[PDB]
Amino acid sequence: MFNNEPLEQIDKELHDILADEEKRQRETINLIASENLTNGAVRECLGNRVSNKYSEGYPKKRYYGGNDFIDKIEELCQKRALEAFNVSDEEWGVNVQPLSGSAANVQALYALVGVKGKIMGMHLCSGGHLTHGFFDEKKKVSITSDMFESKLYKCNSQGYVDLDAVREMALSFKPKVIICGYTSYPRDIDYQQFRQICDEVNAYLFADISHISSFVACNILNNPFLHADVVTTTTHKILRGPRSALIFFNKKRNPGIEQKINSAVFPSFQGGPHNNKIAAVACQLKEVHSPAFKEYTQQVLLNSKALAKALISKQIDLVTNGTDNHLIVVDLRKFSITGSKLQETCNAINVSLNKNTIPSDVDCVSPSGVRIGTPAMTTRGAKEKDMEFIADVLARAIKITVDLQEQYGKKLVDFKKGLPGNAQLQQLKQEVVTWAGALPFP
Amino acid sequence: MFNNEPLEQIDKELHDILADEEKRQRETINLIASENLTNGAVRECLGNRVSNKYSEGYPKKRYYGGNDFIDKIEELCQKRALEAFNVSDEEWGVNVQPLSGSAANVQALYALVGVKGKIMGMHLCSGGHLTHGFFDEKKKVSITSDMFESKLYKCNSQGYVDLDAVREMALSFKPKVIICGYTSYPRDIDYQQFRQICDEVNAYLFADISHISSFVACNILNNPFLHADVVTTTTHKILRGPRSALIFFNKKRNPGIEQKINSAVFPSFQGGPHNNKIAAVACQLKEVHSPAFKEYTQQVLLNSKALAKALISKQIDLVTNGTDNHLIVVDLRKFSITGSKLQETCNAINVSLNKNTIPSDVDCVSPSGVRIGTPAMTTRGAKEKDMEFIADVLARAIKITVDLQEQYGKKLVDFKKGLPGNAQLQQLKQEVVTWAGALPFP
Ligand SMILES: Cc1[nH]nc2c1[C@](c1cc(-c3ccccc3Cl)cc(C(F)(F)F)c1)(C(C)C)C(C#N)=C(N)O2
Ligand SMILES: Cc1[nH]nc2c1[C@](c1cc(-c3ccccc3Cl)cc(C(F)(F)F)c1)(C(C)C)C(C#N)=C(N)O2
Ligand SMILES: Cc1ncc(COP(=O)(O)O)c(CNCC(=O)O)c1O
Ligand SMILES: Cc1ncc(COP(=O)(O)O)c(CNCC(=O)O)c1O
Ligand SMILES: [Cl-]
Structure with missing residues (x-):
């Protein structure tokens, strides 16, 4: 006395969101250190x-x-x-x-x-x-x-x-x-x-x-x-x-x-x-x-070293100036943009990362960093040579974030109004999707 | 950079326990009230x-x-x-x-x-x-x-x-x-x-x-x-x-x-x-x-009422003498067998139920009842008429449990020794498996 119709038949509404979710995973550069x-x-x-x-x-x-x-x-x-x-x-x-x-x-x-x-x-x-x-x-x-x-x-x-x-x-x-x-x-x-x-x-x-x-x-x-x-x-x-x-x-x-x-x-x-x-x-x-x-x-560690080195090569500061493991914390203070602004910018380009505090931050309001990590992308087949592309995409997101802050202002509500439709983001998103989309997906 | 071989291929060891467990579920009269x-x-x-x-x-x-x-x-x-x-x-x-x-x-x-x-x-x-x-x-x-x-x-x-x-x-x-x-x-x-x-x-x-x-x-x-x-x-x-x-x-x-x-x-x-x-x-x-x-x-309630009534028809006592819901607690004091004994006997015949206290028990030590419920078997298609067979199987288990206790004694270590290879249990198990195996399985 049960309904054994497949998920797509039983609940088409739910099955579309889950198929959407999967597409977004397949076309994301996932740098969540915990994922x-x-x-x-x-x-x-x-x-x-x-x-x-x-x-x-x-x-x-x-x-x-x-x-x-x-x-x-x-x-x-x-x-x-x-x-x-x-x-x-x-x-x-x-x-x-x-x-x-x-x-x-x-x-x-x-x-x-x-x-x-x-x-x-x-x-x-x-x-x-x-x-x-x-x-x-x-x-x-x-x-x-x-x-x-x-x-x-x-x-x-x-x-x-x-x-x-x-x-x-x-x-x-x-x-x-x-x-x-x-x-x-x-x-x-x-x-x-x-x-x-x-x-x-x-x-x-x-x-x-x-x-x-x-x-x-x-x-x-x-x-x-x-x-x-x-x-x-x-x-x-x-x-x-x-x-x-x-x-x-x-x-x-x-x-x-x-x-x-x-x-x-x-x-x-x-x-x-x-x-x-x-x-x-x-x-x-x-x-x-x-x-x-x-x-x-x-490989996780090799990609993480390679990423840290490529970020430093582009004059981006890392907390403790490097990494011994899978994860890196980027200190964004030299650009005068907060962690949440760069997370918002990275969301718009299918780059998943999170805002993160740094030693100088006293309050969890306005953390001055982002945390990134390589396990996910290493699982998807990325090598050391692929970290330059990721480092480049991240440098480009910081620069765009800095442009948008000047145009729309330092307040977060104002900043986000700048995001939808942005030609450079649409362009950068496009490059991300095309690269990420190609990688092996479990 | 991952192994995407199916479970049978990647872990044949785990997959055999799982396929066994699935068989045990298909071939059990599952009366666990919470299952x-x-x-x-x-x-x-x-x-x-x-x-x-x-x-x-x-x-x-x-x-x-x-x-x-x-x-x-x-x-x-x-x-x-x-x-x-x-x-x-x-x-x-x-x-x-x-x-x-x-x-x-x-x-x-x-x-x-x-x-x-x-x-x-x-x-x-x-x-x-x-x-x-x-x-x-x-x-x-x-x-x-x-x-x-x-x-x-x-x-x-x-x-x-x-x-x-x-x-x-x-x-x-x-x-x-x-x-x-x-x-x-x-x-x-x-x-x-x-x-x-x-x-x-x-x-x-x-x-x-x-x-x-x-x-x-x-x-x-x-x-x-x-x-x-x-x-x-x-x-x-x-x-x-x-x-x-x-x-x-x-x-x-x-x-x-x-x-x-x-x-x-x-x-x-x-x-x-x-x-x-x-x-x-x-x-x-x-x-x-x-x-x-x-x-x-x-139907869960109908099956539970029918089950309560068939058990009382066979002179088995129920806590509160009935049910308003999916579950029954059988009071086993009149046979002088504990709930843990009947749980062992029912395990031996592929009948899943649990031991459960009754009002008379001062302690949680040696509970005098078992709890049974109908949601699982109702999901497997059992109707009111099928509850007489479950009630039959349960009465037969209580009677066997009473025989074994006579033969090997009231001590649980002594009691269990009588269960493996018991002709009536092997016979009763056989009837359970045959009836249970046939029912719809989601
Ligand atoms: C979400 C989470 N869980 N465990 C966590 C975190 C982090 C974190 C927590 C929190 C927060 C603060 C107060 C109450 C509840 C929460 Cl979840 C805030 C931020 C911030 F946005 F400010 F950067 C970040 C992070 C990994 C995302 C974190 C940091 N840094 C640490 N060390 O540990
Ligand atoms: C296992 C479990 N979880 N929640 C539960 C139970 C039960 C239960 C709990 C316990 C116990 C006692 C002390 C410490 C820890 C535990 Cl898990 C003992 C028995 C007994 F075997 F004695 F009948 C049974 C039951 C549903 C199986 C239960 C009862 N009756 C209730 N009312 O609620
Ligand atoms: C060190 C540590 N311990 C425990 C947990 C808790 O795990 P659950 O979320 O499964 O409760 C986390 C979560 N980590 C969140 C993150 O780093 O993104 C963690 O980083
Ligand atoms: C009333 C009640 N509340 C909470 C729980 C806890 O559920 P979890 O096991 O999902 O933590 C149970 C478990 N009931 C055990 C049983 O009746 O068989 C329960 O019977
Ligand atoms: Cl789960």
């Missing part, structure tokens, strides 16, 4: 009937039966996760149930500290995540600043984590957790130095590696699993999986952490896991442990 | 490339651009939701971003009361959800009992919500929210009477309708939108959508609630929404507003 493109096999998992099943609890300790095939899938996912991140399952555990990155972080933090517990993370404006304890004078913006008592550290004037300031803050604040790993930090992390600071005050070391997960997995960047008590990561950014998350916990350093984390995820915070997610995560993690994927990750 | 089966079009949405997009924020107030097509999908979903539940978009708002039922409840509760806020819900042992404030003498099991201060109301000896106990508790406890709508409650709810209790103490009325959502949308059962401040619901149970959730809020009755709830979902708790989920929710919500789906929901 990627899933393959068909991952998308077959996400649409699999396995999501019909309720499987509350954990494998071999389920509330319901009928979960033997679900149990194999969840155990396969956990093992492939540990294999992927070069960890022994005798020393490390993984929970694969968190529905997304923010949920994973709130759950892990709760496990370690409980309500009113003390946490330390990087300020949002300096490249930390919202779930790393973010608040504002106006409000406790994240639950992580409200259900916990948080204190926030800044990066220095050159865009670098200031360990001396982290030390100063930890000794006066005495937190139970210190969070590292960030949302828009262009350099590698000194986890060793973080671990030394956590020992000094007796806090746990939490590494959120969502942005750099593939660099850790493939031994291209520093390894937080050598020093951290907990590692969280999303599966959807550079890892190129579905939208989900993983919490890793160090059993050897913390006996009985396994129960704290598993009970935090369920039944403290979640109900039924989404088994289509877990299935999809299994599928991608098998690709992650191939040497073919180490090739892809290596 | 259903998604059609092909909803599963096309869940595997759609729309999940590649990061779209933090709300439509027309997004942190990024490139979200024109995402915004159309999210607005279509909110509209179709309000229409489905017969509410005016001038008086009611809806948030469609929550990733699951539990997330939605925690978010909504936080919005209304904040950290340390006082909440009241039905005890879990009496049929409430974990996210309705559940705790135990050993621990604060849910976050909703920990981030909030909760008090839990019981149902009476006959399995009914005891309003005089709710009132007495509300007046002494003075909570900011009173939660109604349950996980295993076989009757309709007196929302009007709850509204009268909340008004008396100046608390919000929160209706969790996840189990009965289709009955509310189709006007078959009472309408909580007449009296509630907030209504939450999952989209995956009787509604037959993907795994996601909805939070409804009464703007007329509470000016300024719209902001409290939207901000609580993001950026307080979540990050990026899962747009495949939202697309999927949109697709199903179109089906919900057809008269064809009203027919389906009517």
Whole structure:
């Protein structure tokens, strides 16, 4: 007693917007540092009937039966996760149930500290995540600043984590957790130095590696699993999986952490896991442990170096003057245009990027930068030689943005009136679409 | 630079478990009250490339651009939701971003009361959800009992919500929210009477309708939108959508609630929404507003009544001696077998059901009942006449379960040893498989 008519027949209205969405993806230069493109096999998992099943609890300790095939899938996912991140399952555990990155972080933090517990993370404006304890004078913006008592550290004037300031803050604040790993930090992390600071005050070391997960997995960047008590990561950014998350916990350093984390995820915070997610995560993690994927990750970094170099060649400033990873933050202060103006300009030319704060910015109103990254375009087949074209398109968007600011003025409402119909944008959009449109598309 | 080989080719290991799991579903009498089966079009949405997009924020107030097509999908979903539940978009708002039922409840509760806020819900042992404030003498099991201060109301000896106990508790406890709508409650709810209790103490009325959502949308059962401040619901149970959730809020009755709830979902708790989920929710919500789906929901109730009646005809006791909805709780005390035993026996015959407390049980340890429901088998085409066969199969399972307990003893470890290779189970399993396998499968 159901309608099994295909999506196009059942709902033509929805199917047109989704076919439109797909066209826009195929014809966009996607520089969102956090975005990627899933393959068909991952998308077959996400649409699999396995999501019909309720499987509350954990494998071999389920509330319901009928979960033997679900149990194999969840155990396969956990093992492939540990294999992927070069960890022994005798020393490390993984929970694969968190529905997304923010949920994973709130759950892990709760496990370690409980309500009113003390946490330390990087300020949002300096490249930390919202779930790393973010608040504002106006409000406790994240639950992580409200259900916990948080204190926030800044990066220095050159865009670098200031360990001396982290030390100063930890000794006066005495937190139970210190969070590292960030949302828009262009350099590698000194986890060793973080671990030394956590020992000094007796806090746990939490590494959120969502942005750099593939660099850790493939031994291209520093390894937080050598020093951290907990590692969280999303599966959807550079890892190129579905939208989900993983919490890793160090059993050897913390006996009985396994129960704290598993009970935090369920039944403290979640109900039924989404088994289509877990299935999809299994599928991608098998690709992650191939040497073919180490090739892809290596290319991400090669494109990112090449892009940073080409942008600097065109006299565009980068925060920390370069990158050790997949992402770059452009400092737009020498042009006297804000980040949101360039995002608007880049939207008009099918270039996807986001506004981003820089060290000099005190207020999240009018961030002076944009963040860009290469995972998506690297997935679509772009090489080092292709980064000059992207750098050129970005230089051309900055110049147009500067022209429009002079013509229509510095206020944002006025500025946007300048965008539609602009011959140069229409021309530049055209060049973008034609180039992006041609690239392989999963 | 990706592997686009189909799932069978790229991961033959995962694909065999999935193909097995699909067979187990096709060959099971699925009586899980919270389960259903998604059609092909909803599963096309869940595997759609729309999940590649990061779209933090709300439509027309997004942190990024490139979200024109995402915004159309999210607005279509909110509209179709309000229409489905017969509410005016001038008086009611809806948030469609929550990733699951539990997330939605925690978010909504936080919005209304904040950290340390006082909440009241039905005890879990009496049929409430974990996210309705559940705790135990050993621990604060849910976050909703920990981030909030909760008090839990019981149902009476006959399995009914005891309003005089709710009132007495509300007046002494003075909570900011009173939660109604349950996980295993076989009757309709007196929302009007709850509204009268909340008004008396100046608390919000929160209706969790996840189990009965289709009955509310189709006007078959009472309408909580007449009296509630907030209504939450999952989209995956009787509604037959993907795994996601909805939070409804009464703007007329509470000016300024719209902001409290939207901000609580993001950026307080979540990050990026899962747009495949939202697309999927949109697709199903179109089906919900057809008269064809009203027919389906009517049949759910018809099958549930017929099933209740056939079970009573065979001298099986039901909590509250019947049902007003899709679910029944069987009271197994007269046979001296526990709910976990019958769950194991039913697993052995490809009958999916869960163990469930009954009023007499002091503890959640050794529940004396099972919960069953008709949405899944109603989706598979079963009619009133087919309920006698399910009732037959269930009575036969109880009798086998009673025999095995005699033979191997009342201890669960001893009991289970009698299940593999039992001639009658192999026989009964065989009958189940043959009948179940034949039914329409979406
Ligand atoms: C959207 C998001 N999520 N997590 C995030 C961000 C970012 C961000 C957040 C926010 C914001 C501020 C207050 C409340 C809620 C939010 Cl989402 C603002 C901007 C700005 F527009 F100002 F550039 C940007 C970014 C990646 C887009 C961010 C930065 N920089 C970091 N470090 O982390
Ligand atoms: C699994 C689950 N989620 N939400 C739930 C349930 C149930 C349930 C919960 C629990 C439990 C108890 C303590 C801690 C954690 C959990 Cl998950 C136990 C049982 C039992 F097996 F004993 F019958 C059952 C049910 C639907 C399966 C339930 C009941 N009854 C209710 N009212 O609500
Ligand atoms: C370090 C980090 N951790 C957690 C999250 C949360 O993931 P979900 O959105 O799945 O909740 C993000 C989001 N990153 C947003 C961005 O960089 O664009 C992140 O950057
Ligand atoms: C009333 C109610 N509310 C919220 C939830 C949570 O939904 P998620 O699992 O999507 O978090 C449930 C789950 N119900 C479990 C069952 O009845 O089988 C529920 O019964
Ligand atoms: Cl999903």
